[PDB]
Amino acid sequence: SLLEFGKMILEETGKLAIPSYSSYGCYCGWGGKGTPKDATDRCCFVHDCCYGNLPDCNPKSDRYKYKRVNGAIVCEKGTSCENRICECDKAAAICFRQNLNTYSKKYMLYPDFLCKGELKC
Amino acid sequence: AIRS
Numbered sequence: 001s002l003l004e005f006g007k008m009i010l011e012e013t014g015k016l017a018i019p020s021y022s023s024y025g026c027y028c029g030w031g032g033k034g035t036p037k038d039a040t041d042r043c044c045f046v047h048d049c050c051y052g053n054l055p056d057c058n059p060k061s062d063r064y065k066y067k068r069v070n071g072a073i074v075c076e077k078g079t080s081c082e083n084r085i086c087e088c089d090k091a092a093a094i095c096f097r098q099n100l101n102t103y104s105k106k107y108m109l110y111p112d113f114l115c116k117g118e119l120k121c
Numbered sequence: 122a123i124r125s
Contacts, residue, residue, distance in 0.1 A: 006124040021125035029125050044125070092125075 001063045005089045008066075008073070012093040013100060021096065025107045026115035034115025037107050043095035049121035050088035057081035059088070066090070 006017035015021065025041030026034035031048040051059045064086040065076040073093065075086035096103075 002124055009125055017124035018122075022123070024125075 002060045004063060005092070008089055008093045009096060012097045015096075015103075019108060020103075023109050025110050032115075033117060033119075035117065035119065037110065038102055038104060039099040040096060040103050041107065043092050043099060045119070046095070047088060047092040050091065051085075052121060054081065054084055054088075057085055059085045064089075 009015065009017040009021060013020075021040075021044070022029040025037040025044065026032075027036055027041050027044035027048055029044070031044055036042040036045045051057075058081070062079075062081055062085060064078050064082040066086055067074050067076060073090045075083060075090060077083060078086075
């Protein structure tokens with residue numbers, strides 16, 4: 001679920017998902033069009049694609065379980081949708097962690113008109 | 122309320 005993803009993001013990065021990742025660049029929080037602005041925004045682009053891989057799942061609301069094995073995120077077995085959603089979220093949280101070194105506050109609340117053109121998954 |  002979105003709330004679970006937000007907790008995973010905070011655990012991983014120390015940033016609150018709202019507002020650090022809810023309106024960032026072209027793809028974080030309301031993704032659709034544009035060239036991703038930076039590596040963090042590319043995490044969101046890929047995460048959007050990952051959810052797009054699951055048209056008959058409901059990643060905003062469906063809850064999954066996971067645990068930590070010495071820092072590592074381990075998705076625990078639920079329904080097929082839950083497992084796949086968890087793997088998408090895990091990857092994005094890791095990606096955000098890997099790209100904190102270039103996170104830029106200037107991309108928070110990024111205006112829609114600066115995001116143009118389709119980019120295929 | 123609705124995040125990432």
